Structure formats: C-alpha cells, structure tokens
Design an enzyme around this catalytic site. Structure first.
Site, PDB file in Angstrom:
ATOM      1  N   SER A 264       1.481  -3.811  -4.385  1.00  0.00           N
ATOM      2  CA  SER A 264       0.616  -2.855  -5.082  1.00  0.00           C
ATOM      3  C   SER A 264       0.634  -3.035  -6.608  1.00  0.00           C
ATOM      4  O   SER A 264       0.110  -2.206  -7.337  1.00  0.00           O
ATOM      5  CB  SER A 264       1.016  -1.425  -4.715  1.00  0.00           C
TER       6      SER A 264
ATOM      7  N   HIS B 218      -0.521   2.674  -4.207  1.00  0.00           N
ATOM      8  CA  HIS B 218       0.770   2.140  -3.819  1.00  0.00           C
ATOM      9  C   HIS B 218       1.090   2.392  -2.339  1.00  0.00           C
ATOM     10  O   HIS B 218       1.542   1.479  -1.649  1.00  0.00           O
ATOM     11  CB  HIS B 218       1.867   2.730  -4.712  1.00  0.00           C
TER      12      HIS B 218
ATOM     13  N   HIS C  54       2.638   0.054   1.143  1.00  0.00           N
ATOM     14  CA  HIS C  54       3.549   0.478   2.211  1.00  0.00           C
ATOM     15  C   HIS C  54       2.977   0.385   3.618  1.00  0.00           C
ATOM     16  O   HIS C  54       3.665  -0.071   4.540  1.00  0.00           O
ATOM     17  CB  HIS C  54       4.012   1.915   1.959  1.00  0.00           C
TER      18      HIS C  54
ATOM     19  N   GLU D 204      10.679  -2.029  -0.714  1.00  0.00           N
ATOM     20  CA  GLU D 204       9.967  -1.923  -1.985  1.00  0.00           C
ATOM     21  C   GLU D 204       9.748  -3.266  -2.680  1.00  0.00           C
ATOM     22  O   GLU D 204       8.643  -3.536  -3.139  1.00  0.00           O
ATOM     23  CB  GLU D 204      10.691  -0.975  -2.940  1.00  0.00           C
TER      24      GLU D 204
HETATM   25 FE   LIG Z   1       7.117   2.674  -2.611  1.00  0.00          FE
END
Ligand SMILES: [Fe+3]
Ligand SMILES: O=S(=O)(O)CCN1CCN(CCS(=O)(=O)O)CC1
Ligand SMILES: O=S(=O)(O)CCN1CCN(CCS(=O)(=O)O)CC1
Ligand SMILES: [Fe+3]
Lengths: 400, 389
Positions: free
Chosen positions: A323, A259, A264, A304
């Site tokens: 992700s 992730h 990110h 996010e």
């Molecule tokens: Fe995150």
C-alpha cells in the site's frame, strides 16, 4: 472503561453438587452487579462433563470482588480457574472466547480514530473531522451478526482512492508476490475493486469468508495489540472505513481504507497465508504481555512488511509495502538488508515506524512461517493450550 | 414458482480468453433478467485456476433459454457443466451452494377447526419473513398452545430417563439451563439455534412452506435444520404421529447438540447434495430409520434416539415390546425397507454408534452418481465442488 474477568469450571453429569450449584448461580445471576453472563456447555474434553463459563466486568483493575465469587463458588464444591484483564500476573490473561465476544472491543481504540494528531493533514478540516466522527460511530455501533454498513463515499474521497489505486497497481505485477497477482483480478471481478470506486467492507467480507473463512469487522482506529491479535484467532480482521485526507494522497501513518483494502485484504484470500495469520492470532490467545509484544514484532516483519523469495527475486507480500509506493520502490534495492524470517530471531528486532524499513525478513512460504509461529507459540509459558473450533467459532481450552 | 439452474466452468490464470469471457459475463448480467448471480473464486484443485459460477432462474421447467446461454458461453472457449432443478434428467440435479441459498426454498385430528387453521396460517406468515442473516422471528404463543406444550412436556419427561439414549439425557439439562426448556414456557427457535451453533455448529431455520425431501436433506449439508413452530391441536392427546414444535424441540434438537450425531446428520445431507431423485429417496428412507425412528445400543439394553420415538409415548412403549422387530443398522438394508407413517413402526434399526452410522452412510453414498465431488469446508461453511469426476 472496564476490566473483564472469566471464571470457568467443569462438573460431571449426575454430580449431586449440580442442584446446589445451579441455585447458587441463579442467585448471583440476579444479585451480583458485575456478572454479565453465565453459560453452560458440553465439555469438549470429557464426554460426561459440563463446562460452566461465568463472565464479569469490573470498573477497576485487580477488583478484589472476584475473589469473593471464587470463594463462594468453590464452596459449592467445584474448582474454578479465573482469567482476567490486568497488568498484574495474579490470574492468567483474559481472552474473548466466542467470535461474538469481539463486540467487547468496539469502543477500545487507542488512536487514529476521530481524535487526530495536530500534524494530521486533516486535523483542522471541519468537514474531514465531521466525516471521521460519522465513520467512527459506525464501527462503535457495529455488532457481530450485522451487515457492515455501506459508506456513501464522496467524489473527493473516491478521487483520493483513485490516485492511490492507480499508482500502486502499476507496481504490483513486478513487485508483489504471486499470490497477490493471483487474487487481485478476483477482487476486481467480485468486490468492485477499480479506480472509480471504493470497495465496501461487506462485499470484501463475503468474498473472504467463501475463500478462506476470514471476515472483516469495521474498527474505529488502532486497537491494542492484544485485542487486534486475539481477533485474528477467529479469522477476524479489524479494518477501518475512512480514507486519508485528500491533500496528502501518497502517504499517511494511519491504517486508512487504501492500506486495508489494497495491502491487507488480498493475501487473506490465500489459504496458506490465511492459516498463517490465524496462527499468529492463536499464539496471542492468553499470552503474557511480554509475548504479545514479541508477536507484534513478528506481525510487523511479516503481515505488515514481509518479503517472499521467488527464484532469484525478492517480492513483497507485506501490507505496509503493497500500500505504499515509497516502500515498494525501496525494498527491491540494496539500500535495505534482507534476512531469512525466523520468529526467534526477528521478535527482538527494532524497527522505525516513520520511515521505510532498513531491514526486511524473507519468508520461505506461508506454510513454513505458520509452522515456525507454532513453535514460537509453544515456547511461550501458557497455563493451558488452546484450539480453534471452526464449527462453533470458539476457542477451546485444553489442559497443560 | 421458480426453476433454478447453475452453470459451472473453470479457466486458467493468464488465459487468452479471459478478457472476452469477462465482457460476455458483464453483458448478460446487465441484459438478462434471468441471470441472478455471477461469481468467481479460487479453484479448490488447480492452484493456478479460477472457478466461475453462473446462476439462472426461469419461470418454467427446462427453459430452452438455458441452452442458448450454454452455447454463447462455450463459444468464448470454456467447457460448461450445467446443473438444473428438473424432473427430467437432461442435466444433473441443482443444489444450493452456500447457506444463504436455502432462502430459495422459502416460498416452496381436528385440523378442520377454522380457528386452528387460521392460527397455523398466522404462524406461517410470521415465519414467512425470515431470510438468512435475520433473527428467527419469535412466536407469541397463546395460553392454550402453552398449556398443550406443558402436557406433552411433562408426559415425555417422565419417560426419557428410561427410554431415551444417553446423549438425550446428557443434553436435556443444558436445554433447561440455557434455552429456557420448561413446561411453563415454549422455547424460541432463535435461542435454540444460538445454543446449537455454540455446541456443534448446527443452526435452525423456521419451516416456511413444507419442504421437499431434497430441499430438507440439502439443508442438512450446511448443518441447518428446518423446524416448525406450530403447536398440535388440543384434540390431539399425543397423536402418536404429530410433527409439531413439541416434536422438533424435544425430539430432534437435543441430539443435534451431540458432536457425533451432528456429524452423522450432516453426512446424510452431504450425500443428498446433487444426488439423483432415486438416491434422494434412498436417503429419506435411511433418514426415517435413523434420525426419526432409530434406536441405539447401550450395553445390553436398547434405547431410542429417533425424534419420532422421543416425542411419542405410544412409540416409546412400543419399541421395547418383543413384537417389534429390531435389526442392526445397515443402510443397504434400511434404504428400501417399506414403513408406515400413521402407525407404530413394526421394525426398528439399531445403530452401534453415531460415528459408525456416519461412516456407513458415507460408504453407502460413495457410489451415488454425481457430476462433481462434494465436500464441506468447516472454515468457509460452504460446499466445495471438485471437478474430478
Ligand atoms: Fe497494516
Ligand atoms: O482453505 S481454507 O481457508 O478454506 C481451510 C484451510 N485449512 C485451515 C485449517 N488447517 C488446519 C488447522 S491446524 O490443525 O494447522 O491448526 C488446514 C487448512
Ligand atoms: O461440531 S463439533 O465441534 O461438535 C465436531 C465436528 N466434527 C468433528 C469430527 N470431524 C470428523 C472428520 S473425519 O473423521 O470424518 O475425517 C468432523 C467434524
Ligand atoms: Fe421429525
């Protein structure tokens, strides 16, 4: 645990109060058991003034000792302003002042560290539990200035990464925003992104520093929202080093390395997204507990789970989407609502954390989202305004 | 000793040649022991382009092997721009691109006292271990060295309030309060660096070997000041030409904590990045008449900000005398003015303000021939190279 307070004040060069002030400070430097640091610096707002910074730690919240310090200090003829970590609103909220002050967060992880939930696929895996402990220790002992320790990932760990990597990469060209497609070959070329290998945080940090000045610190697990967001003000991203358990490779509620590194990291090498992310960070500096919660929601619906529009198409830039194969395959459909992003609209919106999003927000561009977040930050009631200085890597406080 | 070369080129996203390009880069990386680094980054101009950087290192000067690499590289379809460390002008001058590249500089009256010469070697050895990212090694100074520091400190401190520019008087008590400045103790570079970083983003490196003018000035572009740690021989009263640690810490360091001076100093550094040898000489001389021996205007008075004045009692006495000529600072005048290094200065240049001197330098350096436009990015702490020449 401990609670931090900071006291600050100014005095003009040549004040006849300086001599007595320094004597007072030497006294408490030795005799006050809660003082952790005393520093003086050139004022950034008045060329003839000095700024003094006193940092303290107390074992309990609302520790009435700091009032004693304020009283003594103001008897020396200076006017002190005090910031404090507290649920009370007696003083405005404390924040880290220096990029190095992020070290204070090192052992403040709420969950998803080496303490797993009973339904965690690796909860009763003794090897996995030992591994999580090992990896967590690294974040706990990491200090600003250090090189991030490289993890000797196992064959099983590398295999899990590969499964995730290969699934996601098939979807990126059609589903991710173009900044992602721009940046990803650079990650392959410079940071060792590939299915056969888990990239090391130190390499990623070096790459990001040179692109946008962002850098990575390893983190044990979830920080509090205030701490995590405050870190963003310094263009510091806290990232985990562990990987999800091998038995459930295509899903995890935890922010594991897949992730962090696939979701990110790439967008942080884009200058406008990087500025936008820092803007969110700056908004959080000394913000009220209420406003931090508004900022968390804004973060959720952008960093996010944010979408961008490209022509007639919708694409994903949110890390939680990029992700997750599920989420990537959800957002494009009419199964979910889309709205234009607006922090004043989005900050109050509810959202599930254990399913795909039923609602996404679409940003026009990262430059507009940045400008929007600045309007939002200004709408907060803050006792003062703040400013990042990239040369000193420090928050500067400005009156009003 | 090594000669560094750098090869720059750019390529567009979705180019047909990228695949073979990458393959070629991976092979030479593996099999050429002279390729030290290959990296790619987002372009600073074309939002759709990638920048590539090839760093090479050879034992000899103008190694014919560079040409071979340029050739094979350009056969894969890109136009390469090559920079090189060389006394020849076949390629434009090489420069360090990031702060860590300053690591590459590292190897590069009573001095006839064997004990003192052995001491100097020892301090150099302690310093020699430093690389970017490390703490600057501390020096355990001897009793005699600390005594010498005390004499110089107390003497100079007597003169500062009446002879030094106001920025120096402003910062000095901060050095006392935060960096351990006192006559009883010699401050360590690591503490000074930390304080400077937190004021103006400036940092210290210990002087390892002695630096060429290009290397030293190039350091300034990253807001990095190279400072020596040795202390003058005791037989030196005030040598009144003595570039030791007393000179660095009492002369250079305080001004670096002033934001405008810090910008002015970096401006000189930026100008030097990739400049020709003859332009480097112009800047060294400008540096001499400012950072080392410059004066400032304070109302109707003249005061000293030059480190070589601040650390010399004789120089401080000399500049106010009428036989010492003073001129307004103009880099076009100063840049080819001759100067003495073993006597007092007969001529000093007076700056109106450090922001003006900075703007003057930038204007001065604007016509320097360079293959690239050079600029500093405060967020990345790096040199940005713009291929707009
Ligand atoms: Fe995150
Ligand atoms: O491309 S890089 O990441 O290297 C630097 C990008 N840079 C960041 C700072 N902003 C202005 C700050 S603010 O005034 O808008 O707060 C301009 C763009
Ligand atoms: O390091 S400090 O925080 O003390 C001040 C850093 N300094 C501030 C002023 N700007 C001028 C840019 S320009 O005016 O030449 O465009 C350069 C950087
Ligand atoms: Fe000097």
């Amino acid at each position: 645990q401990s609670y931090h307070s900071s006291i600050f004040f100014s005095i003009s060069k040549g004040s006849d109060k300086i001599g007595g002030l320094l004597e007072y400070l030497e006294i408490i430097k030795k005799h006050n058991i809660n003082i952790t640091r005393i520093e003086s610096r050139p004022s950034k707002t008045e060329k003839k003034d000095y700024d003094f910074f006193l940092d303290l730690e107390y074992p309990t919240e609302n520790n009435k000792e700091v009032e004693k310090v304020i009283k003594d200090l103001e008897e020396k003829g200076v006017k002190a302003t005090t910031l404090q970590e507290s649920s009370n609103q007696t003083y405005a909220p404390w924040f880290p002042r220096k990029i190095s002050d992020l070290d204070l967060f090192a052992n403040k992880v709420l969950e998803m560290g080496s303490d797993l939930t009973s339904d965690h696929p690796g909860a009763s895996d003794p090897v996995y539990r030992e591994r999580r402990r090992e990896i967590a220790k690294i974040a706990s002992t990491y200090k600003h200035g250090d090189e991030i320790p490289r993890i000797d990932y196992t064959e099983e760990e590398i295999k899990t990464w590969g499964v995730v990597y290969n699934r996601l990469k098939e979807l990126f060209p059609t589903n991710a925003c173009h900044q992602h497609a721009y940046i990803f070959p650079l990650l392959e070329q410079n940071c060792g992104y590939s299915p056969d290998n888990i990239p090391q945080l130190q390499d990623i940090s070096n790459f990001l520093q040179e692109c946008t000045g962002w850098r990575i610190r390893p983190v044990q697990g979830l920080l509090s929202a205030r701490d995590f967001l405050n870190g963003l003000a310094f263009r510091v991203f806290h990232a985990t080093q562990y990987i999800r358990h091998p038995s459930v490779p295509l899903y995890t509620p935890e922010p594991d390395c897949c992730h962090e590194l696939l979701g990110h990291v790439p967008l942080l090498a884009d200058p406008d997204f990087a500025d936008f992310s820092q803007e969110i960070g700056l908004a959080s500096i000394g913000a009220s507990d209420e406003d931090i919660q508004l900022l968390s929601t804004c973060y959720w619906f952008t960093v996010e789970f944010g979408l961008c529009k490209e022509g007639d198409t919708i694409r994903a830039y949110g890390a939680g989407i990029l992700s997750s194969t599920g989420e990537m395959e959800h957002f494009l459909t009419d199964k979910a609502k889309k709205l234009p992003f607006n922090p004043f609209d989005a900050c109050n919106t509810e959202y599930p954390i254990t399913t795909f999003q039923p609602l996404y927000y679409v940003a026009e561009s990262f430059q507009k989202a940045k400008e929007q977040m600045r309007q939002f930050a200004d709408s907060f009631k803050k006792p003062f305004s703040i400013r990042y200085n990239p040369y000193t890597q420090s928050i500067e406080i400005l009156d009003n």
